[PDB]
Amino acid sequence: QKTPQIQVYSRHPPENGKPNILNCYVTQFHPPHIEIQMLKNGKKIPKVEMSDMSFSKDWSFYILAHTEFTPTETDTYACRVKHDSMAEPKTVYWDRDM
Amino acid sequence: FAPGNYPAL
Amino acid sequence: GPHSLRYFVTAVSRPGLGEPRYMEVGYVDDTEFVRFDSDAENPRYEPRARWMEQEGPEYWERETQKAKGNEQSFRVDLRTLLGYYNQSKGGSHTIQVISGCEVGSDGRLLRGYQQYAYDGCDYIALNEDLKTWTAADMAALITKHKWEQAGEAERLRAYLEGTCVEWLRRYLKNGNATLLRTDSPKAHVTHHSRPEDKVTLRCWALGFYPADITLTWQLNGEELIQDMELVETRPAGDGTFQKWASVVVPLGKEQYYTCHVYHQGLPEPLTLRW
Ligand SMILES: *[C@@H]1O[C@H](CO[C@@H]2O[C@@H](C)[C@@H](O)[C@@H](O)[C@@H]2O)[C@@H](O[C@@H]2O[C@H](CO)[C@@H](O)[C@H](O)[C@H]2NC(C)=O)[C@H](O)[C@H]1NC(C)=O
């Protein structure tokens, strides 16, 4: 059992009003069963694309969730993940200043 | 072009 | 440079919930180009990169038939391994396989491979010679013996040196505009306060292709690799990649640290500072 690393980041440096892509990269996990949801202001974002599923040399799993988005000064975004290694679902917020 | 016929373990 | 064709296979049992989850994901270099998922409404092999529109319907039909057959062979495998390991039918288990070939810039084979894991641990693997197998435990030794009596290595070797190489070359041709391009990284540095008069400097590299890159921080002309934190290079949702590396430095001394970015699209490496 390996607990997922959860990384949330945009394709371009965020500029309010400019289209972008938000990513949630969930990695280094095992077993493979997992639930990944991207959220905007606490609400599930529909039609998120899952891609780039692979595993590393130590067999842990990697997968990308991504969606198009136009940031605004008020909207908040996060990625919520449920996996057996964790007692509670883990919610990771997008940090636009990282 | 994918492998075909992964022999059984 | 060199290129690779890889297929990642995963089969996951779900006792009480029907048939195992079966997925195949194919990559040229670090770009996803085909996929099969048993949990789809009408499971079929599908293109995941635009250039795969160049294959005709027969390609998809063959890959789909192959995937369906593979799904059944892995279902059998999951049962078999319960026997080899004396495990119960109530638990979920996972089989993973990676198969692939790599060629150099001239299109000639560099290496081929196929490795299996059960529940995240090495099970069996083809040796570098493409002739014999190596087994991790006594269960895999049963498999090794089966595969040796059936001559499986020879058939796999022919796939790896032959088919795999020929199709990789074809994909590189067909998808040249995507696969053989270079997108140069754009870099920047962010700054974050910390307690104890220390500062975190983070060097970002964005928008690059291919994925290989090196990010280092220097002080007094030395790399500081030992003190850096970083993330593994990661896909950014549009076929490009990103990465960051940070260091913690004394406040008021940020100007003495430089980030360096080395990449195929940078004749001269980038040098930045806060
Ligand atoms: C990529 O290669 C093409 C040429 O080959 C083909 O195009 C691919 C999309 C794929 O379908 C292959 O199987 C094809 O064989 C290059 O296009 C040509 O090169 C020259 C110079 O521009 C031009 O005179 C020719 O007319 C082009 N040939 C065709 C059929 O269009 C193209 O330059 C390459 N792309 C990049 C960005 O490297």
In order of their start, the domains of chain C are 1-181 (3.30.500.10), 182-273 (2.60.40.10)
Q: Ligand 1 centre and the CA of C208: distance in Å?
A: 22
Q: Strand pairing of C21-28 and C270-272?
A: unpaired
- Candidates C209, C164, C205, C160; CA nearest to C182 is C209
Q: Which technique was the structure solved with, according to the deposited record? A: X-ray
Query: Residue C100: how many CB atoms within 10 A of its CB?
Result: 20
Angle made by CA atoms C160, C165, C166, in degrees to the nearest 5? 125
Partners of residue C81 in chain B, C-beta under 8 Å: 9
A-C contacts (CB, under 8 Å): 76
DSSP-derived letter for residue C29 is T
Q: Are A31 and C121 in contact (CB under 8 A)?
A: no
**Residue bearing the CA closest to ligand 1, atom 37:** C177
User: Do the Cβ atoms of B3 and C76 come within 8 Å?
Assistant: no
Is C174 near ligand 1, meaning CB less than 6 Å away? yes
**In chain C, where does DSSP find H-type helix?**
57-85, 138-150, 152-158, 164-174, 176-179
Distance CA C87, CA C67 (A): 27
Q: Are C269 and C260 in contact (CB under 8 A)?
A: yes
Q: Are C101 and C5 in contact (CB under 8 A)?
A: yes
Which among A21, A32, A49 is the nearest to C12, CB-wise? A32
| Chain B residue with the nearest C-alpha to that of C144 | B9
Q: Which residues pair with A36 in a beta bridge?
A: A81
Distance CA A15, CA A91 (A): 24
DSSP-derived letter for residue C260 is E
Which among B2, B4, B7 is the nearest to C150, CB-wise? B7
Which ligand 1 atom is the nearest neighbour of the CA of C51? 9
Distance CA C273, CA C254 (A): 8
Distance CA A75, CA C116 (A): 44
Model resolution, angstroms: 1.7
User: Do the Cβ atoms of A25 and C25 come within 8 Å?
Assistant: no
Distance CA A68, CA A12 (A): 11
> Residue C163 to residues A61, C101, C112: CA-CA distances in angstroms?
27, 10, 12
User: Do the Cβ atoms of C12 and A33 come within 8 Å?
Assistant: yes
DSSP-derived letter for residue C20 is P
DSSP-derived letter for residue A30 is B
Most ligand 1 atoms within 8 A of CB, residue of C55, C168, C176 to mutate:
C176
- Work out the minimum CA distance from B9 to partner chain C, whole angstroms: 5
- Candidates C228, C229, C187; CA nearest to C208 is C187
Edge-to-edge strands, sheet with A61-69: A5-10, A20-29, A61-69, A49-55
Distance CA C121, CA C136 (A): 9
Q: Are C148 and C131 in contact (CB under 8 A)?
A: no
Which among C120, C240, C244 is the nearest to A30, CB-wise? C120
- Candidates A49, A43, A59; CA nearest to A24 is A49
C194 burial class (0-12, 13-18, 19+ CB within 10 angstroms)?
exposed
> Residue A42 to residues A26, A39, C225: CA-CA distances in angstroms?
19, 5, 38
Edge-to-edge strands, sheet with C3-12: C46-47, C31-37, C21-28, C3-12, C94-103, C109-118, C121-126, C133-135
**SS3 (DSSP) at C52:** helix
**Which residue type, as a one-letter code, is found at position C185?**
P
Is C176 near ligand 1, meaning CB less than 6 Å away? yes
- Candidates C101, C55, C105; CA nearest to C210 is C105
> Residue A79 to residues A47, C20, C109: CA-CA distances in angstroms?
14, 27, 41
Distance CA A52, CA A21 (A): 15
**What residue ranges define each of the domains in chain A, with the CATH number in brackets?**
1-98 (2.60.40.10)
